[PDB]
Amino acid sequence: KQWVEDELEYIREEAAELANSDAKFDAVSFVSERTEEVYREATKQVKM
Secondary structure, X not given: OHHHHHHHHXXXXXXXXXXXXXXXXXOOOHHHXXXXXXXXXXXXXXXX
């Protein structure tokens, strides 16, 4: 549960890390598909 909170702030810290390049304008579906990914790994870590 600490690992999810330490990694969810990293997803914010990398979606605001591209020097705000508007090329990748869609940071909405970046923190969507990488929050689903961090919840699928917490489930893998609980079951391990």
